[PDB]
Structure formats: C-alpha cells, structure tokens
C-alpha cells in the first residue's frame, strides 16, 4: 500500500517526500529547528517527541524524555515514548519497531511521517 508507493512509485515518492518536509518544518521551525533530511533527522526520537507536542497541543517536560540522547537505548526509549504519544492521539500502534526508526530505515520513517501527515493535515 504505502510499500507499493515506496517500492514502485519513485515519482510519487518524491512528491510525497516533498509533502513531508513542508509538513514537518511547518512545526519544528517554531522551535528554531529545521529538517532538511528525512532519512536520519528523526532517528534519535527527539523531533518525533517535539513534533507530537507541536501537533497535539502540549509541552513535554524535559525530564520525561532524553532531549540529548547519549545511547542507542535512549533513542529507542524516545521513539517508543513518541509511539505511545501517537497512540494517545488516536493513531493505531505504528507498524515499525522503534529500532527501525533509530536504524534509519527510510520506509519505516516515511511510513510514520506519512501516517502523521494524513492525520494532522489541517493543523496550523
């Protein structure tokens, strides 16, 4: 579905990747933070945590996650916490394992970002 899109529609894929860069910068720039590379910039879980708060209307106390993660483990925990916030916002449990995000699997990352886009289309 999204896989068919990832694997067999490169022209669409870039239009979609384009959609996503605009979609995520719409929000993170408010924190003076920019996303230029979808492939890695969400790997450590921080932006996903900050994005969820920007998207669902709350602040995340800095003691609730690792703002500057110091290990693979802390990144995993951040992604997992972000995935929990996603489910609190009403999304079904994400298909990728938190490790897949941290390991920079592009399909996995884009799936998560795509499901966010399709949910949070109209948020300003």
């Amino acid at each position: 579905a999204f896989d068919t899109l990832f694997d067999h529609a490169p022209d669409k894929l870039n239009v979609v990747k384009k959609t996503l860069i605009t979609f995520v910068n719409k929000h993170l720039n408010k924190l003076n933070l920019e996303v230029t590379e979808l492939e890695t910039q969400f790997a450590d879980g921080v932006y996903l945590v900050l994005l969820m708060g920007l998207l669902e209307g709350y602040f995340v106390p800095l003691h609730s996650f690792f703002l500057t993660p110091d290990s693979f483990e802390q990144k995993v925990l951040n992604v997992s916490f972000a995935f929990e916030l996603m489910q609190d916002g009403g999304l079904e449990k994400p298909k990728p394992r938190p490790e897949d995000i941290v390991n920079c699997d592009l399909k996995s990352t884009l799936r998560v970002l795509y499901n966010l886009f399709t949910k949070y289309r109209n948020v300003e």
Partner: protein, 268 residues
C-alpha cells in the same frame, strides 16, 4: 471507602470531551455536580488501585477556597475511573476572565480572587506530603455562586492521567518545566504559577496566547521567555508580581506571607 456508586449518577448534559476523557453536568444525592470521566489507554489493576489511593486526598472539606472532590467511582465496577465535584455556576477562573460574554469582573473582584487563591494554596501547602501533580492555573480554579474562587481538586492529575504531557505550561515555573517534581521545591514552583495568575488578572489576557503549548514550554525552559511586566500599574502590584516570579525559587514568598499583603489590598 467503596466510593460512589456510578449507577446513582444522573448524567444531565455533556460539557466537554478532551485528552482526559469527558465532563458532564449531572446530579447525585441532591447535589448539582460535574462528573469527570477519565479515559485511560492500557487501564490495569495497578492503575485502578492507584486511582482509589489518590482520590481520597482530593476530598478536602475544610477550607472555603478549596473545592473538594465529593467522591469517585472505582473502575471496576464502574465503566471508567470517574470523579465528581460540585457544579460551580461561573465555571473556571479562565472562563470568567477570558470567556465572560455577560460581564467583566472589576479589579476589586480580581484582588479578591487573588486573595481567595492565595488562602486556598496556603492551606494546601500545609498538607504533608503535598498533593502530587497539583498545578495551579486559571483553568484549575473555579468561581462559585458568590464569586468565591476555589482551588479545583478535580483538576489534580492522576499518576496515569496524561503523564509527560503539559497542557498549561504558561503557568509553570521554569525549573518545573525541566526537573522532576522530587528535584524541585514544589511550594516555590506554585508561587511562580500564582505570579502568572497575577499577570493574568492585571492584563486580562491569556499568557503567551500567540504561542502553542510546545513553544511556550520550550522557550520558557531554554530560551528565557518571560511575561512582560505590564505598564501603568502601581509600584505595589509591580513589586508583588516581581517577587512572586523571582528567577530564584528560594527568593519567592510563601502563600501565607502574601495573604496579609493581599488582605490589605482589598481595603488597607
């Protein structure tokens, strides 16, 4: 300590649904009430036990500026962990200040609100230990039939209730945006919240209204974002607001210290 029987509740009209669950206006045992229905993902026996242990502390009947939780329905056997409190005709301080289409409260009433809240907080600060996860803000204070402001015990967050999400960071002390509660002087953190309430009573504006909650918490915590002290106010109100919002938590007064200051401001 079996709590309130959920089946006895008369649900009259739904007032809200949000991240926490829902709120209804209702009736129970001749009381006009609101019913807060908490929706919780991965509800467990541990969380249920926790709810039943946390609720009793909110049943505070001994201070006129504290609005008790009347009781709670344990879940099971109730469909959802639920709590009840008296219906307050004017709703929240936030409603009265920011959403008051009928009338605008005058500054004398604003001073009385500040005094009511200070008295209520001084009382709550006598409790040992403090009630956990109690945050002071204009949404968590109610206004009764006679314009008495009352701290909303039904607004105290449960251990399982949106942990790691703050929906009203604008009233939170900078240290409290970043440090675990155990690592802060909670009473000083609460005085910061009161200082923001003072600012809100003076401006009749929502603090940082042009910013999202995530922007607010990130900028106050890490960029030094502060309310600007309003111009054209007495040196006395100015001095009070300043000391309550001291960057140094240790230098902020206690509530019991500002009570007499507020009392003199009604009528010296």
């Amino acid at each position: 300590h079996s709590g309130i029987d959920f089946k006895q509740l008369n649900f009259l009209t739904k007032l809200n649904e949000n991240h926490s669950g829902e709120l209804w206006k209702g009736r129970w045992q001749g009381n006009d009430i609101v019913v807060k229905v908490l929706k919780v993902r991965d509800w467990s026996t541990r969380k249920s036990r926790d709810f039943n242990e946390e609720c009793p502390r909110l049943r505070i009947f001994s201070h006129p500026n504290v609005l008790p939780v009347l009781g709670a329905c344990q879940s099971p056997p109730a469909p959802h962990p639920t709590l009840i409190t008296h219906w307050m005709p004017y709703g929240s301080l936030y409603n009265v200040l920011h959403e008051g289409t009928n009338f605008v409260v005058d500054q004398s009433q604003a001073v009385k609100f500040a005094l009511d809240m200070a008295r209520g907080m001084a009382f709550l600060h006598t409790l040992e230990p403090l009630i956990p996860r109690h945050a002071l803000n204009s949404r968590s204070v109610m206004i009764d039939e006679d314009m008495t402001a009352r701290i909303s015990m039904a607004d105290v967050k449960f251990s399982f209730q949106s942990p790691g999400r703050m929906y009203a960071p604008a009233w939170v002390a900078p240290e409290a945006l970043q440090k675990k509660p155990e690592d802060t002087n909670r009473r000083s953190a609460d005085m910061w919240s009161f200082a923001v309430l003072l600012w809100e009573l003076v401006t009749r504006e929502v603090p940082f209204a042009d910013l999202s909650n995530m922007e607010i918490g990130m900028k106050v915590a890490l960029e030094g974002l502060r309310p600007t002290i309003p111009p054209g106010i007495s040196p006395h109100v100015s001095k009070l607001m300043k000391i309550c919002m001291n960057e140094d938590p240790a230098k902020r007064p206690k509530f019991d210290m500002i009570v007499p200051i507020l009392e003199k401001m009604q009528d010296k």
